[PDB]
Design a protein around this ligand. Structure first.
Ligand SMILES: Cc1cc2nc3c(=O)[nH]c(=O)nc-3n(C[C@H](O)[C@H](O)[C@H](O)COP(=O)(O)OP(=O)(O)OC[C@H]3O[C@@H](n4cnc5c(N)ncnc54)[C@H](O)[C@@H]3O)c2cc1C
Ligand code: HEM
Ligand code: HEM
Ligand code: HEM
Ligand code: HEM
Ligand SMILES: O=C([O-])[C@H](O)C=C([O-])O
Ligand code: NA
Length: 568
């Protein structure tokens, strides 16, 4: 049996999986995944029969309901989605090796017979607002437009929701929240603004930064008002004080936030379509938006008529070819991103007239795990970890900006470095348990034994932590002037995580204004068209601050949905 339907036909009828006419229910395959779940159980039930002590195909962090068909296709062999980032030992029946090859918008130019026919038919739906992309900005935008009295359709090209947003760890920057108040933090949006602007090297558009800071408490108040926990306020690089909010005790902010937005779209019955890619923004004869053409992976091309289209497609940090064109020094680096973060959403924007900006500014996250090929939150350093090179020495202020840390780390022997911390640090940030669980955190009861495990000079490293630890006690890092030295590393065992920069965020993208309206090369608004989140440029300038993109997607997402819903 060469495929799963074949294998199942053997002892079962076509309509155990299909509807009575046999047509696919929709591009989310709702009816058809329901059939799967009626015989094999829900996702959790199936993981119960798939256990492995360190991994489970049917488990993970992905928020929302994760279709069986995200990995099991019926009439063809298919791929395990977790192979886009991991290499877990898998035995998927009817597997084929992960390979993402998605046509670019320009390639889809070849489909002009199908596209023309779709366009000559009537709209498949007629609504007020179409929001493209189910990451943080997309959900927020759908929600705020629904709540502003707009009818929404939310489309996601992947099989699963959440984009890069569901991967977020260290936190959401907000200032002068009650959450920093209760933790005895003192900040102003002026300070969040001035951290931002200096962090971006003054490249940032000041009015967008001004919206980011001025609305950040409100954005956190919004999410909390909706079901989120963002009471743990941690430090991140280039911030003056702590302001990265995440759930109580340091757990990842991303999966959680995407799971609160998701329940909030569901509570409101928001029409959410998976395996549905936004292809072309359509315009009327006075150049304002009139709808969008989309490509359903399962039912084909079709268009939706609407007054406003919200592009919330995220960045292009998975696309190294486009990154390497813009920054040749990144060419070849591994990315931290989900597999579809390739910038098609930008092409859609440009094709509609939107002009791009700040596109050559691409952030590399300083600490991707050499071993796991996954990002290790910067909150590990904010909660007190240091970095050491192979000589067992510190070489950089670990809570500096990302450009600078990345550069420092690449200049170290073997082009990588090590996060080193103890149980005090581990205990303060539950996410670390996740890296310990992934196996990327070697551990030992002394620094000589850890250095010996890991190839770092043992006595040097020992002497390094003891100087660090006196520096913590005496409150001033006179070696690298790290301004926040929150913990001595002297409680319980020790751990090391081998780290090196990976491609992580594109700070450039479509030009938007304070209302989240896309503009053109002459700086004119494109009536009906908005942009929110990593798809935009102007917010983070030359260097984004850890913590700011999540605050960015919530604030621009939310404002775009209200601007779009009022626009109509
Ligand atoms: C590993 C990791 C951890 C991070 N941790 C943090 C953190 O702690 N704090 C922080 O501030 N930032 C963090 N960042 C950055 C932040 O999560 C991203 O900047 C944010 O996800 C941008 O959100 P968005 O809504 O703009 O896009 P995304 O969340 O990336 O979502 C965009 C969605 O659009 C879909 N889409 C794309 N093109 C189309 C199309 N044509 N049609 C339909 N759908 C489309 C994409 O598939 C995706 O699902 C992290 C990023 C990564 C990769
Ligand atoms: C797309 C829909 C479905 C998917 C992805 C799915 C998943 C799977 C997979 C991956 C296998 C193993 C294949 C192999 O071992 O070679 C399997 C076997 C099996 N499936 Fe399906 N399933 C689906 C729908 C159904 C339905 C509708 C039924 C019953 C009417 C069903 C009942 C079974 C049974 C009975 C087995 C064999 C062993 C057992 O569980 O007793 N499944 N299924
Ligand atoms: C001989 C029996 C079957 C026939 C004739 C049949 C018919 C079809 C057709 C024509 C399609 C493509 C639809 C389109 O492109 O519009 C399709 C896809 C699909 N079918 Fe079947 N079906 C059969 C059995 C099954 C079985 C046994 C399963 C699951 C175990 C299943 C689940 C699905 C799903 C989930 C899809 C979407 C695409 C995919 O995963 O390949 N069908 N089927
Ligand atoms: C309710 C949802 C799903 C159902 C009903 C389903 C069905 C199944 C079944 C019945 C098996 C065989 C395991 C056994 O017989 O013990 C299996 C294996 C597998 N499925 Fe699923 N699956 C679903 C969701 C997913 C998803 C979302 C993914 C990928 C992210 C996935 C990837 C795999 C893999 C990789 C294996 C092989 C297991 C291993 O080597 O540990 N499945 N699936
Ligand atoms: C069903 C799909 C997947 C499964 C079951 C899975 C499994 C895991 C496991 C077992 C760990 C170790 C920690 C833990 O216990 O949670 C982990 C961590 C991690 N995985 Fe995955 N993985 C999946 C897909 C992905 C994808 C597609 C990405 C990137 C787009 C990714 C990125 C990461 C990252 C960044 C971590 C580090 C810990 C954290 O940030 O919470 N994973 N995952
Ligand atoms: O290190 C993180 O958790 C993270 O990746 C944070 C941001 O802002 O990009
Ligand atoms: Na951007």
């Amino acid at each position: 049996a060469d495929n799963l339907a074949e294998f199942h036909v053997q002892n079962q009828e076509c309509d155990s999986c299909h509807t009575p006419d046999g047509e696919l229910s929709n591009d989310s395959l709702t009816y058809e995944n329901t059939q799967c779940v009626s015989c094999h159980g829900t996702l959790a039930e199936v993981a119960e029969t798939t256990k492995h002590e360190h991994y489970n195909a049917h488990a993970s962090m992905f928020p929302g309901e994760v279709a069986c068909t995200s990995c099991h296709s019926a009439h063809e062999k298919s791929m395990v989605y977790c192979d886009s980032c991991h290499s877990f030992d898998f035995n998927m029946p009817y597997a084929k090796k992960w390979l993402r090859d998605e046509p670019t918008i320009a390639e889809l130019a070849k489909d002009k017979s199908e596209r023309q026919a779709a366009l000559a038919s009537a709209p498949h739906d007629t609504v007020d607002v179409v929001v493209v992309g189910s990451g943080g900005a997309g959900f927020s935008a759908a929600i705020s437009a629904t709540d502003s009295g707009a009818k929404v359709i939310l489309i996601e090209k992947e099989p699963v929701i959440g984009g890069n947003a569901k991967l977020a760890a260290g936190g959401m920057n907000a200032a002068w929240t009650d959450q920093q108040k209760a933790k005895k933090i003192t900040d102003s949006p002026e300070l969040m603004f001035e951290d931002t602007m200096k962090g971006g090297q003054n490249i940032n558009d000041p009015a967008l930064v001004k919206v980011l800071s001025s609305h950040s408490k409100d954005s956190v108040d919004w999410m909390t008002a909706m079901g989120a926990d963002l009471t743990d306020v941690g430090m991140m690089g280039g911030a003056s004080v702590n302001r990265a909010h995440r759930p109580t005790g340091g757990a990842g902010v991303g999966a959680h936030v995407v799971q609160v937005l998701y329940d909030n779209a569901v509570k409101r019955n928001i029409d959410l379509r998976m395996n549905t890619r936004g292809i072309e923004v359509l315009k009327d004869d006075k150049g304002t938006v009139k709808g969008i053409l989309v490509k359903g992976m399962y039912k084909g091309y079709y268009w939706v008529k609407a007054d406003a289209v919200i592009l919330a497609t995220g960045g292009f940090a998975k696309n190294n070819e486009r990154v390497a064109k813009l920054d040749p020094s990144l060419k070849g680096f591994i990315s931290t991103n989900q597999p579809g973060a390739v910038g098609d959403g930008l092409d859609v924007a440009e094709n509609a007239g939107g002009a791009l900006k700040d596109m050559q500014y691409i952030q590399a996250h300083p600490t991707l795990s050499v071993k796991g090929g996954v990002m290790v939150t910067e909150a590990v350093r904010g909660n007190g970890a240091i970095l050491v090179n192979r000589e067992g020495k510190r070489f950089v202020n670990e809570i500096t900006t990302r450009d600078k840390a990345s550069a420092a780390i690449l200049a170290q022997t073997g082009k990588s470095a090590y996060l080193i911390f103890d149980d005090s640090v581990r205990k303060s940030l539950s996410k670390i348990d996740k890296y310990i669980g992934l196996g990327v955190a070697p551990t030992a009861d002394s620094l000589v034994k850890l250095g010996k495990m890991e190839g770092i000079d043992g006595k040097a490293l020992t002497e390094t932590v003891a100087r660090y630890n006196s520096l913590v006690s005496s409150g001033k890092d006179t070696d690298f002037e790290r301004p926040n030295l929150p913990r001595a590393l002297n409680e319980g065992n020790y751990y090391a995580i081998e780290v090196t920069p990976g491609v992580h965020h594109t700070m450039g993208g479509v030009m938007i204004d304070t209302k989240a309206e896309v503009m053109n090369a002459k700086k004119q608004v494109i009536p009906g068209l908005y942009g929110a989140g990593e798809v935009t440029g102007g917010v983070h300038g030359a260097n984004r601050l850890g913590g700011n993109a999540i605050s960015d997607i919530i604030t621009f997402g939310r404002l775009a949905g209200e601007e779009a819903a009022k626009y109509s």
